[PDB]
């Protein structure tokens, strides 16, 4: 087994001679072979506050991390980094990392206060944003690293320990760890794409953050995970929210196909921006196409039970349960972000309100089907979850239309106990 | 089972675009009628 | 490595064409394969509460879980389940579990408020007792499950890191874990026993809860483990409390018989109900033998020391070895009950008197060791147990044994603990 | 994979018939192979207080652990120990551990309060000096162990777990954990094919984990010395989520810095124990990496953080270091010793009586070498690199001398930012 240098959503050379080095929600960085040297481009997705440029390499960089403040480059053998801020006022600097025999650099990070270089023996060197060193720490070997505003997410690995994340937050002086080396649920691998697995053996395509502060990771199972309740020490769950083996199978008309793939860039409120690469080679090529979108669906469908109902059309008796889960999950990521840190844009309250309106409404497509087959106990327990009170009396008028008269009493028994709750 | 009227009361508890759609509609009716 | 569909206390086919699927304290299942379908035979131990029913298996259900309320079946390949309560009023619903290419269903579980199905890619699907889901979650792959009234036990094993339990509970509000993937102190294994390892490669025979809320597991190590103080994460420690192979050598009286295999059933605060399997097979067969019960015993005896002791002549153990076991059994079983009465309330009502029975036996089991400590003319062997006694009537009885041994300096040391204990 | 028993800093037989068993600051104990029996020799280091005695081994006591109070022994096939204290204040009693088919005992422990014996399948059997059992507990297999007055430090290993340490404490009537089964950053010996012909095969046949010695500090912080030839150190272990493994020393640098740029491999490093800041050592010089009779004198060695580059010292010509490099190493090396020492005071207090004086002697040289970066950065006209250095100066007297450095740089705009940091201390200090 070998270690390879990792950068978010990179791509290898192939038979061609120009590749990307990173690709995230700010810009994409490409490189081009001049047999002696390299010509590195830093092009941006935003246009207003930023400019693009290009410069000439004389060292052979293959590691970068592009974000808002700076652009931290790297070199995988000599241990040579360079930090190029986007501002014209602050100058660059260069430092050469100590390396022992038979050692590499795996991945780097460019937080607005710290600069982290993690090597392939476990060392954890932390500078400041001008080049004054702060610490040297020994941990497990690191194979991926990323950051947002102040927090830092990483993936340790050894040949005998096994995969483990770690989620810290180097603030001004606060170094509150949250999870230190807990295990992580992901499946590593075990052809036209044999050129890919020589390049990245770990199988992580591109890990990133959300726009609200929730870690994600896009495994080689093509299943975007997500972490919830990470401010709490003992409630973290890994909710899968998308299968790229399923959204393609719907859009191909109920058919196996080997032409459309998925390459992720970033996450939004509920949409995923994707580079739908079409071909054998599952990396995008030059020029970079337009980022499409794709919605998130909880994986509750059946590959067989849709085909017996015949693009793919779903019956409402199966589509009702999926919207029950999806507005249930999205509320727990929204009701805490306001309560702990707060809202950024200001419109966070009304989308919260309209998300509850999709929650009770999607339950009533199921609650009516429970009365249709003469079932009082199954339809009883469903009326304990409607936190919206104006849909409680709305259910009573559905109880009389199905003529289950004992059930009409039980809902009014629920309303009174939640009525006396408010007075205290 | 229709929930849309029960949903239509849930949310409730001259416009400058519409004038331009009427000027564009009254203009197409003008040029072709005798 | 192959992931096989584990079932609690389940036996393979073998040469015969009828085998069991489950076993616990309330019932068990046998199945017979006829010419075209399978014949599942539910059959109980208690007759005073419920009734036997049995019918034809249309798909080849090979996973099951039997509890006090109902039962739950499922096909590991296709992924179709079935939930049949023992009451006739509530209905039996059938839901199909969504699966992927190359994926099994490892184990199932049934709570009176929830239903869990864990697959071999890590999904942790949770329903209620009617068929309304709550969440779909992603963890490490699962090989065993076990539930009680509110709390669920799990066992994970990846292809990389593995062997780690996770003791959760399914609260009415939020699933608040207690151990999220802590490492498991249990040993994977290193012909009639060939097909037992092609059927269950981990060698886990039966995992369950106690009747006082403490998990246990009986694996292929032939040793009963038990987790103490599971609620507090500071002092949660495993206490191995029964050797199964050493009780066989203790009853035989100096004979090592390698055809008596043990099969545990449940725990009832003192005793372990077993199936004394005799034969080349380590698993029982048709018909099922009677329950046999063994009083629990610490593994604090030596093979060679009991051999030379019982060389002149059941195993006769000296009092010097006898009170060593009785001290630890009074030491383990004391602490397990005091937090449960403090946090879960009484269940049987007479619990406070049982603590007096152990704490009474706590004193005597030290005092037979206390005379075992001073009879080897060593002063240093005895003085620490004067601290380790609990009662004050014990230290009153500890001063009369020190006077007949002619140790005047050890008399005043026991007196010094009284100035520490009176305050 | 085959397990092997362990002892702190124990050499193998090699080819001769005498070897040592343990080695620490108390003294080194050694055996001599009688052809049929064995002959233990227990030698100390402080001869004015305690005295060298010895006897004959009839059972092969190859596991041992020597401390200030007693000297434990043990056989890893019979499971028979015997506690023989130094003076005639206790007897020498013997208790036999029940062993099973294929089981071994890998290590022992010797504390002033308790006795700990761990087997090769996890039966953490606790005794005391008074000889009573406490609890048989089941954990992962154990290949290493050490302890101090109450605490214990262990290293587990399995075929299905990987390396994991455990720091717990035997209190009075309850045992509490701090880091139960957390994973470990240590290299395992990557034994290649050419080492089956090397002179060091017999060491690696003796010890596959490659841990040469583990021990505690003089103040009570854990350490290790593996096959990476680095001295790891755990800090801040009281906080359960802010543990740090800081490599305070690399032996592979002090060979090359002291040989004058030579890649000579004929000198090695062998640790015994750790002082306040210097490290006692045994400098073996030969084809065998283990010390041999008679053992050389315990020599001292100062610690160095690993911030030096091999290449950039080659154009600077014992290899000499510039002042442009020596401040930054001294800034870090004084920073972590100002973190370990303080938390021992505000939890325990003084252990020898002189802790405040060595404390205030260190924060001055920290603030003194921090000025050397300030004078180099102002001459390169990077005034924002100067501002980032300012917030670290702990004493107020450090800020006063830094004002006089700014006036020789001819930056009247920079000095306004520094004085506003000084007065901003005054508001919070009154709260």
Swiss-Prot record, chain B:
It comes from the Eukaryota. Changing residue 27 to R: In sld5-12; temperature-sensitive mutant. Defective in DNA replication. It is found in: Nucleus. Belongs to the GINS4/SLD5 family. Required for DNA replication. Functions as part of the GINS complex which plays an essential role in the initiation of DNA replication by binding to DNA replication origins and facilitating the assembly of the DNA replication machinery. Component of the GINS complex which is a heterotetramer composed of SLD5, PSF1, PSF2 and PSF3. Interacts with PSF2. This is DNA replication complex GINS protein SLD5. The chain holds residues 3 to 74 of 294 of the full protein.
Curated annotation (Swiss-Prot), chain D:
It is found in: Nucleus. WD repeats lie at residues 226-266. It comes from Saccharomyces cerevisiae (strain ATCC 204508 / S288c). Present with 3280 molecules/cell in log phase SD medium. Accessory factor for DNA replication. It plays a role in accurately duplicating the genome in vivo. This is DNA polymerase alpha-binding protein.
């Amino acid at each position: 087994f070998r270690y390879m240098p990792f950068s978010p959503a990179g791509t290898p050379f192939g038979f061609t001679d120009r590749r990307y080095l990173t690709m995230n929600e700010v810009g994409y960085v490409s490189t081009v072979k001049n047999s002696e040297q390299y010509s590195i481009t830093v092009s941006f997705f935003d246009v207003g506050r930023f400019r693009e440029y290009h410069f000439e390499d004389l060292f052979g960089y293959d590691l970068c991390f592009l974000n808002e403040k700076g652009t931290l480059f790297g070199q995988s053998k000599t241990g040579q980094i360079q930090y190029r801020p986007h501002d014209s006022i602050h100058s660059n600097w260069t430092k050469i990392i100590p390396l022992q025999a038979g050692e590499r650099i795996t991945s780097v990070a460019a937080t607005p206060v710290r600069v982290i270089v993690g090597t392939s023996l476990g060392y954890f060197r932390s500078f400041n944003q001008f080049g004054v060193p702060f610490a040297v720490e020994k941990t497990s070997p690191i194979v991926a690293l990323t950051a947002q505003n102040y927090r830092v997410f990483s993936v340790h690995y050894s040949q005998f320990h096994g995969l483990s994340y770690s989620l810290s937050e180097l603030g001004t002086s606060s170094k509150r760890y949250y999870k230190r080396e807990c295990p992580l649920p992901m499946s590593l691998p075990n052809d036209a794409n044999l050129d890919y697995y020589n390049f990245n053996p770990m199988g992580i395509k591109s890990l990133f953050f959300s726009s609200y502060g929730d870690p994600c990771i896009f495994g080689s199972d093509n299943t975007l995970l997500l972490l919830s309740k990470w401010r709490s020490p003992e409630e973290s769950k890994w909710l899968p929210i998308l299968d790229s083996n399923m959204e393609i199978w719907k859009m191909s008309g109920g058919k196996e196909t080997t032409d459309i793939h998925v390459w992720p860039l970033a996450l939004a409120y509920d949409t995923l921006n994707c580079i739908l690469v079409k071909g054998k080679h599952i990396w995008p090529e030059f020029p970079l196409p337009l980022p499409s979108e794709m919605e998130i669906r909880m994986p509750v469908f059946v590959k067989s039970k849709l085909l017996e109902e015949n693009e793919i059309q779903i019956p409402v008796s199966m589509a009702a349960e999926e919207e029950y889960l999806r507005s249930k999950v999205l509320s727990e990521l929204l009701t805490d972000t306001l309560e702990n840190d707060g809202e950024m844009y200001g419109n966070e309250n009304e989308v919260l309100a309209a998300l509850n309106g999709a929650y009770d409404k999607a339950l009533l497509r199921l609650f009516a089907s429970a009365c249709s087959d003469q079932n009082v106990e199954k339809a009883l327990s469903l009326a304990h979850e409607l936190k919206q009170d104006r849909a409680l009396t709305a259910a009573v008028k559905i109880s009389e239309r199905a003529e289950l008269p004992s059930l009409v009493k039980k809902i009014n028994n629920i309303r009174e106990a939640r009525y006396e709750q408010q007075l205290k | 089972i229709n929930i849309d009227d029960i949903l239509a009361e849930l949310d409730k508890e001259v416009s400058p675009q519409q004038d331009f759609s009427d000027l564009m509609k009254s203009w197409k009716n003008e040029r072709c009628s005798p």
